[PDB]
Amino acid sequence: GMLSRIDLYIKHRDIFLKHLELLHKLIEKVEDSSLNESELLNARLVDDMFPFNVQAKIATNFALRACCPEGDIDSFCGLKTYVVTAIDYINKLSEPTLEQLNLNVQDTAGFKEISMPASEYMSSFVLPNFFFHISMVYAIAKNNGVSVTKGDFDGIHQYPKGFS
Amino acid sequence: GMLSRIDLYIKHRDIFLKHLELLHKLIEKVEDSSLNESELLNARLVDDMFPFNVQAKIATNFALRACCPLSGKEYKELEGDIDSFCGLKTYVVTAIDYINKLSEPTLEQLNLNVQDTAGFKEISMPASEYMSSFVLPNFFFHISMVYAIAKNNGVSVTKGDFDGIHQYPKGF
Ligand SMILES: [Cl-]
Ligand SMILES: [Cl-]
């Protein structure tokens, strides 16, 4: 019953942690791709959608918003630090009580003020939004000639590699 | 424990069901956008990435890959027409109805490892890990691509069409 919310939280917290680490490893790959730093960080897919660095910042902020209840994103060094700061913070956090997971979280979803139990807030609201912005980081990277496969996104898919 | 396995399956299944329904509602919006049908379905976001209709197909098959072994069924790709809005909607509705009608998994089925292939890598993971660590991120990747392609082709979509929680002012 209710105790499974603790198990759901641990599983999804570990999923945010894993994908934040894959995001940090993606930024390292984009860095060593011999591409222009500023051009890459400000690169978009859709004209009215956020650029690469802002997509990485939003995804990181969504992981923090889910797990808790500043920085330079204009350089690869600063954006990596931003992600590492979130990873280290989330790892420091103690295992939640059932009472914490039933506490209502107050947030805004566009123009709508939302109130959800922290458990549903993490899995129903944050989790899909986190994956949306993570997906945008990967698609922008692929669009700018970065050699990325599904393996860089989930750490489970594997494809034959090259050399040189 | 055992209680945890039943509840995690229900939560993950309900998330797939919710987002497949939002995907169905998205295709209805794209259909009613007075855009060219074939152009919109074959539209890409990145040249080396799958088009709109194939992104919707893969997302739907990821939901089926997560739910079929849990009710003791051998996953087979859903066949159908994805080259028309009517066929693509039918494809998603077929998956929703199928998932909804699946029998509640047995204790034995919940305790079994799921065998699959991720590219060239063979995997064997317990039901909870397979659904949440493997399927769920991949499901949301392809769902995200459907939304981004729709937005790129002038379709009026907001985050509300993606998660059913975000709200913005609506048309007059
Ligand atoms: Cl965006
Ligand atoms: Cl793709």
Q: What are the chain A neighbours of B49 within 8 Å (beta carbons)?
A: 139, 142
C-beta of residue B8 within 8 angstroms of C-beta of residue A119: no
Q: Which residues have a Cβ under 8 Å from the Cβ of B129 and sit 6 or more positions away?
A: none
Identify the bridge partners of residue A92 per DSSP, sorted by sequence position. Answer: none
DSSP A28-65: HHHHTT---HHHHHT--SSTTS--HHHHHHHHHHHHHH
User: In the PDB record, what is the listed experimental method?
Assistant: X-ray
Q: In chain A, what are the helix, strand and coil shares in percent, each to the nearest 5? A: 60, 10, 30
Instruction: Give the range of the structural domain holding residue A111, as residue numbers without chain letter.
Output: 1-164
Task: For residues A81 and A75, give the distance between their C-alpha atoms in angstroms, rounded to a whole number.
Answer: 10
CA of A46 to the centre of ligand 1 (A): 8
Token pair of A101 as six digits: 């997971």
Q: Which residues have a Cβ under 8 Å from the Cβ of A144 and sit 6 or more positions away?
A: A30, A35, A40, A43
Task: For residues A55 and A2, give the distance between their C-alpha atoms in angstroms, rounded to a whole number.
Answer: 34
Amino acid at B104: E
Given in angstroms, what resolution was this structure solved at? 2.2
Question: To which residue do tokens 């939002």 refer?
Answer: B22
Three-class HEC string of B71-111: HCCCCCCCCCCCCCHHHHHHHHHHHHHHHHHCCCCCHHHHC
Residue A163, class by beta-carbon neighbours within 10 Å (0-12 exposed, 13-18 middle, 19+ buried)? Answer: exposed
C-beta of residue B82 within 8 angstroms of C-beta of residue B88: yes
Task: For residues A112 and A119, give the distance between their C-alpha atoms in angstroms, rounded to a whole number.
Answer: 19
C-beta of residue B156 within 8 angstroms of C-beta of residue B32: no
- Chain B interface, best mutation among A3, A11, A161, by max B CB count within 10 A: A11
Rg from Cα positions in chain A:
17
Q: Which residues have a Cβ under 8 Å from the Cβ of A29 and sit 6 or more positions away?
A: A141, A146, A147, A148, A152
Task: For residues A14 and A2, give the distance between their C-alpha atoms in angstroms, rounded to a whole number.
Answer: 19
Number of domains, chain A: 1
C-beta of residue A59 within 8 angstroms of C-beta of residue A130: yes
Task: For residues B166 and B157, give the distance between their C-alpha atoms in angstroms, rounded to a whole number.
Answer: 11
Task: For residues A57 and B154, give the distance between their C-alpha atoms in angstroms, rounded to a whole number.
Answer: 26
Rg from Cα positions in chain B:
17
Task: For residues B56 and B149, give the distance between their C-alpha atoms in angstroms, rounded to a whole number.
Answer: 11
Distances in whole angstroms, Cα of residue B151 to Cα of each of A61, A152, B15, B16, B81:
23, 25, 23, 22, 23
| DSSP summary character for residue B40 | H
- Closest by CA position to A7, among listed B28, B126, B114, B51: B126
Task: For residues B36 and B42, give the distance between their C-alpha atoms in angstroms, rounded to a whole number.
Answer: 10
CA distance B136 to chain A (A): 9
CB crowding A50-87: b at 16 or more within 10 Å, else e: bbbbbbbbbbbbbbbbbbebeeebeebeebbebbbebb
CATH of residue A6: 1.20.120.450
Task: For residues A33 and A28, give the distance between their C-alpha atoms in angstroms, rounded to a whole number.
Answer: 9
CA of A79 to the centre of ligand 1 (A): 17
